[PDB]
Amino acid sequence: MVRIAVAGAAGRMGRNLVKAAHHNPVAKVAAGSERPESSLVGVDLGELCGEGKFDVVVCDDLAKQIDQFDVIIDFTAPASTLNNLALCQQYGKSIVIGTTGFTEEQREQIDLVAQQVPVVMAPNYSVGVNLVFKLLEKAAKVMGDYCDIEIVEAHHRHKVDAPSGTAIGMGEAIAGAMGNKLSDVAVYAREGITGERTKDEIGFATIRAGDIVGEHTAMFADIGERVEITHKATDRMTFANGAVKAAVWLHEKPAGFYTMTDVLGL
Amino acid sequence: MVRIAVAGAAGRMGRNLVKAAHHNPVAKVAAGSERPESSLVGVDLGELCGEGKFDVVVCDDLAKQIDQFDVIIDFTAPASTLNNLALCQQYGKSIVIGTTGFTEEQREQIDLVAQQVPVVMAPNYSVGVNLVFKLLEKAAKVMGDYCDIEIVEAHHRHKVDAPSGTAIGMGEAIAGAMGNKLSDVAVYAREGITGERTKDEIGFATIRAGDIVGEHTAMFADIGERVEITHKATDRMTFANGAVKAAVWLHEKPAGFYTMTDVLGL
Amino acid sequence: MVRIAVAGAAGRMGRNLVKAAHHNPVAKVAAGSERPESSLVGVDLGELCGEGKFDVVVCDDLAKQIDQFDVIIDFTAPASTLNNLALCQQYGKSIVIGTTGFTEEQREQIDLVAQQVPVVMAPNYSVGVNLVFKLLEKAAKVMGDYCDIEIVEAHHRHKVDAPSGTAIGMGEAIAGAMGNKLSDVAVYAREGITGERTKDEIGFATIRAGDIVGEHTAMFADIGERVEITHKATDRMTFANGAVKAAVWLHEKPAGFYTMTDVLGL
Amino acid sequence: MVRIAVAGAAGRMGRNLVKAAHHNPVAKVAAGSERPESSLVGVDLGELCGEGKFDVVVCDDLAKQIDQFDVIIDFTAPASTLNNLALCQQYGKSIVIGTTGFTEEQREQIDLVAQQVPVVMAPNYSVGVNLVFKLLEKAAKVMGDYCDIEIVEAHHRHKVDAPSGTAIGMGEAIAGAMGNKLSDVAVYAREGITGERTKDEIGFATIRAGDIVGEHTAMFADIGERVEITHKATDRMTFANGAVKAAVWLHEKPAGFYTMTDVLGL
Ligand SMILES: NC(=O)c1ccc[n+]([C@@H]2O[C@H](COP(=O)([O-])OP(=O)(O)OC[C@H]3O[C@@H](n4cnc5c(N)ncnc54)[C@H](O)[C@@H]3O)[C@@H](O)[C@H]2O)c1
């Protein structure tokens, strides 16, 4: 058994992660955090995910619960997650990171410190999206060189980053397979006269609406046909269960930067 | 019978308009134009749309064919179309305009001169899209005030303007029905940290790929459900037949700014 | 204030209906039922939807809790619902019916006993679907007479009836608006050689998969274009909230067969 | 250089195949057929596809033009195609078959006579669909064993067979990859009470409407997420170009049953 701390436990993901750890018999919910100013600091973890009393309460700092946990699962905010990564380095803990929208500098620090700390990081903990990355590699080898490639993503009205880190990851899987760098081909907007579409651009279209848990579509378009590779997420539990399984997988592994692709054996 | 000049007859629309006039028994293809530098100036109208020889050839200026035609059908480029509108004013001709991406000034000139010239103008000559405008009005009255409204459009790789004039028209039909001005609520891009979506913004997402003749979706999204009103165009003839029918409708009508909504009786 | 009994309270809808009633301040959760053989007979209503203890428990027969409630909300199974309708007739209670897949004979008994009992019945308690019915009427009047009409629906793997009662209701709204009877035109399957599609047929395609809460699409297809009117349900609460509102509306009303359309004022 | 006879040259595919062969510089259009009762017997091939006069006319029987061609490309009707296959066997010709909806017995005769005659056969001549088959194999290996698999297809109102041979081929690629037989798991209809969905079933939903050139979607659905692999055909030329390429490839090859997968090197 692996003992889990859930960072930002009152969050959309947080609540689902507590639920998911609770439902996995090889993983124990041992700690949860929230922002110091949060009105749910002191509330029982179970009462906040409709599972009843767990006998564990929300603290404002995981440093106060170091002896309770092996792995932090972090789907919060980038600054918050880097602090937790430092905490892991300091106390020989491991971390599963789901937070998206890191800057390049922040991401370099993660790559650096993952030499010291066991880390799983991914923009998507669903099986389906990790399969999709693989499908996109095959599709890009066969159609990429002559087709227009467009990435369409839809999320709920509270998502702050655009496009999704998953959309960016799909972009990267396609460009990588074609021997290109995404930044060389990405277009993130179109307004007014754009002129004609270049042949090699990867267009990103971003939808923000309602309670959409997440839709991603990669389109490979020729004159006369197109292949669309689509993933639809209908429940956050699809991410939470994956994250918990990543945590379990991660336990007692040595330092390294691991992806959900590694975890799943893809 | 109404005699038709087709402006920019070698264009994607142009070719289809010739075909469509030829197939309509109450409308006669009498003239066609192309750019002075065009290598298809002098070619027979029929040989360029797979209908065989029509006995009519492409000229570089419709002023040289004034006695041949009653109505110009213009799906070309904004400067070109305004010249044709001036030609109509000068010689008592009528015009059906399908060209999109006019500036505000250009559009003001059209509104002004349509007091003198019989004009049909619309961003979409399909029946389906003109129905959709009406559906969007009803949907906005019932759901608009509490839902997130997003407009997604997809066109072929050669379209120069973004978003489509149809997407803009849908935006305008929705905002109009809610007593708002589109410019007050439209968002045409999302990149980086956007923060949370405002309640009243109308987001536009633009896809450019392959030979897509055109897909438009208006989404009204609540927490737990969404209504999507979608139009898919699969053949340019859907626009061309509408335009020709507009031309026929327009013949001998007095000066005015008429829409495809007027033409169809919606 | 209206007091609600939730039939089949451990069900997918049931749980949501308990939660929705409990959260709505103008309605009270007073009773819940389950099948006599059910292992959750005797469990508290609140522990069934992650809301903690309500001080109300699940009985195997609502006749034993008759003084506790005014309105039954019934999303269970057709035989079960007819028994609850009889209970209403016997004890002067009202009923909101969401159960689908009644036979014609069963439905006749509902119509008949709704002369005595205040009844709301609908295949869909979402606002969105009730708007869609109205949109379908407009679309059918404009495009129905010359276009192919197809209805596509997708639901979760546990749904027992096909097509959905909503799909059937859409079919009925369209055929009604065209002066036809659905049973005259519906086609529910296509296998082997069908030949060409007839002009008048309304095709129904049924998808069963995963945890899809429900997608319905009505398609109006011409040669070259099509209009698709789509509703996507992402959370059962979209139905539960509507049902509770129906219950509140229904309280103290006289006998009659009322729809969600009546309740919403559409 | 390979000389091509196009069976059923006035057909939807036929016309496109003539056009495609004529435009491809490594292949020649030499012969075309139509039904003996056909009013376009005697018409020039070129006037049938807007390419002007080819100096070749439509015969009612390809046996009369046997010295004109090497390869028949046959997208007609199953009985008609079997007659052309017999003609190939009799006169040492080769055949590219696109016709769909053969019975098992008919298909056995194809398999058998392909030991004598060079044959390409496939339900889809698009590159995209041939890639999709490969993607379906990967998706089935990763998600097939625990997810619901559904296949949705949409075609134009004139298609006589259901589901599409492509839909069936997708079903076969998935079942094959899972060590199952399609006929053991396929469900082609759902009406009335079906009960719950079985674990193993592959559901097929068939849409018939308008001028849809063809949409196929394979869905792999878990509780909380789904992967959809979609192909959309927008122009018949996507099939015609593939078929012509198949014909060029097939020229001078020995007897055998070859697929589009062989031709493309997938
Ligand atoms: N990788 C994936 O599979 C996946 C899935 C879903 C979401 N996400 C990503 O996860 C992140 C979180 O998304 P969300 O919708 O759950 O957001 P949210 O705002 O609903 O939840 C984040 C929570 O973290 C808390 N938090 C912030 N700073 C903190 C600190 N210093 N200590 C403790 N708690 C803190 C917040 O109070 C909040 O409750 C985003 O970056 C999002 O893109 C990733």
Ligand SMILES: NC(=O)c1ccc[n+]([C@@H]2O[C@H](COP(=O)([O-])OP(=O)(O)OC[C@H]3O[C@@H](n4cnc5c(N)ncnc54)[C@H](O)[C@@H]3O)[C@@H](O)[C@H]2O)c1
């Ligand atoms: N309203 C509708 O229903 C509808 C439908 C389709 C396209 N459109 C719009 O119609 C316009 C044309 O689209 P397209 O794809 O056909 O573009 P296109 O570039 O394929 O065709 C336009 C043609 O007009 C010609 N042209 C330009 N200037 C000219 C001049 N001075 N005289 C004569 N010919 C001239 C060009 O040479 C070209 O052949 C665009 O603005 C597009 O958005 C509208």
Ligand SMILES: NC(=O)c1ccc[n+]([C@@H]2O[C@H](COP(=O)([O-])OP(=O)(O)OC[C@H]3O[C@@H](n4cnc5c(N)ncnc54)[C@H](O)[C@@H]3O)[C@@H](O)[C@H]2O)c1
């Ligand atoms: N009208 C709508 O808006 C709408 C929305 C969702 C579902 N539905 C329909 O509602 C019905 C239920 O759907 P569901 O997914 O919740 O099914 P479910 O099987 O998850 O729930 C039904 C519940 O009713 C219970 N039940 C059956 N017979 C009973 C009896 N005699 N006494 C007490 N309880 C009994 C079952 O034990 C079960 O817990 C279906 O017909 C479905 O199509 C309608």
Ligand SMILES: NC(=O)c1ccc[n+]([C@@H]2O[C@H](COP(=O)([O-])OP(=O)(O)OC[C@H]3O[C@@H](n4cnc5c(N)ncnc54)[C@H](O)[C@@H]3O)[C@@H](O)[C@H]2O)c1
């Ligand atoms: N494999 C693929 O990629 C692919 C692609 C498109 C269509 N198809 C299939 O190809 C077939 C044809 O499709 P279509 O839409 O072109 O149909 P269609 O009816 O438009 O065309 C078929 C033509 O064959 C002709 N024909 C029939 N019997 C004949 C005979 N004995 N001699 C000469 N001509 C004859 C018909 O008169 C007709 O003109 C169908 O089975 C369809 O499913 C396959």
Ligand SMILES: O=C(O)c1cccc(C(=O)O)n1
């Ligand atoms: O890749 C991402 O950015 C992502 C993935 C899943 C969910 C979310 C989210 O809800 O923000 N974001």
Ligand SMILES: O=C(O)c1cccc(C(=O)O)n1
């Ligand atoms: O509204 C538009 O901009 C529009 C409508 C139909 C076709 C096109 C096009 O092909 O550009 N553009």
Ligand SMILES: O=C(O)c1cccc(C(=O)O)n1
């Ligand atoms: O119309 C229907 O049949 C329907 C509507 C909403 C949900 C469900 C369901 O979950 O079965 N069924």
Ligand SMILES: O=C(O)c1cccc(C(=O)O)n1
């Ligand atoms: O697999 C098929 O059945 C198929 C594939 C492409 C086109 C068509 C068609 O037009 O019928 N049918």
